Amino acid sequence: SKMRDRLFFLLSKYGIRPRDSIGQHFLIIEDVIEKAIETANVNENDVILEVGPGLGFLTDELAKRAKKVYTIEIDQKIIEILKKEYSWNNVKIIQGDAVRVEWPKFNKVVSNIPYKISSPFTFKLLKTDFERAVVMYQLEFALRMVAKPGSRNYSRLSLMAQALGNVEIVMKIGKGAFYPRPKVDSALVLIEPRKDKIVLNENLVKALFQHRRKTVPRALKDSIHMLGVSKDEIRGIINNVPHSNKRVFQLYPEEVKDIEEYLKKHGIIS
């Protein structure tokens, strides 16, 4: 009630509707916020990236614990409310689409993630140098992020998560926890950078996972013909490709790496 009332009061004070769009929901539970923050072990030395501060409930908690918070927000009207409603010495608001603007240097991310950017944000983050991220997604998307090779929901996002991160779902978050109540539950995800990162070619993985249900001979032939190359000058090389008895969705990052190295050696991806 206490944080839901306070939301209701802010929205009417400014006279703004709770969403311009349809993949956006406001965390209105004090203890989930404080749980996100204790899971990330935010300390007086940390420099934190937040995305989509909304009405700044999470932001405000981060500002009182961290050295510096950078928070990225697309809606210029939200930004004006944040500036009038709060008095942080150590918060830097960046107007922008979080998927497009240059990110600050940070050592951690503590953030609710607007669900519409769940995928693009995650790929961008997995390619950053951060100590620890604690982030909220829909539960379906979080189950994808920890899907195992050869399982039915395993996809490009799963591979890159496994290849580049250690990913833990920390707990379910009930739909009661946001306004307006989502139609499915969310999940609090911990991501640390993998100690021994497997660095894979983006174009290759996109190629392979364009249709992840195919065998890897098939997947490779199609993607490289689509680029504009002859089929005849590609067939024989592809049919000594390693892991060729797998469908793409069954591939470990290690196996994708061998396909890369193989294609690299035959000058296809160079």
Ligand X SMILES: O=S([O-])[O-]
Backbone dihedral region of 150: left (phi > 0), alpha (psi from -120 to 50 degrees) or beta?
Answer: left
- In total, the chain counts a number of residues equal to 270
Residue number with the shortest CB distance to ligand X? 182
Alpha-carbon span 219 to 207, nearest angstrom: 7
From the list ligand MTA, Zn ion, ligand X, none, pick the one residue 58 interacts with, judged by a Cβ distance below 5 to 8 Å according to partner type. none
Figure out which of the listed residues 106, 115, 137, 209 binds ligand X, where binding follows CB under 6 A.
Answer: 115
Alpha-carbon span 71 to 46, nearest angstrom: 14
Cβ 55 to Zn ion, closest distance in Å?
A: 12
Q: Is 169 strand, coil or helix?
A: strand
Please report whether residue 97 would count as binding ligand MTA according to CB under 6 A: yes
Please report whether residue 174 would count as binding ligand X according to CB under 6 A: no
Cβ 186 to ligand X, closest distance in Å?
A: 9
Please report whether residue 32 would count as binding ligand MTA according to CB under 6 A: no
Please report whether residue 33 would count as binding ligand MTA according to CB under 6 A: no
| C-beta neighbour count of 210 within 10 angstroms | 14
Cβ–Cβ under 8 Å, residues 94 and 131: no
Question: What x-and-dash track marks residues 176-205 binding ligand X by CB under 6 A?
Answer: ------xx----------------------
Query: Which amino acid is located at 209 in the chain?
Result: F
Q: Is 63 strand, coil or helix?
A: helix
Please report whether residue 16 would count as binding ligand MTA according to CB under 6 A: no
Please report whether residue 185 would count as binding ligand MTA according to CB under 6 A: no
Residues comprising the binding site for S-adenosyl-L-methionine? 25, 27, 52, 73, 97, 112
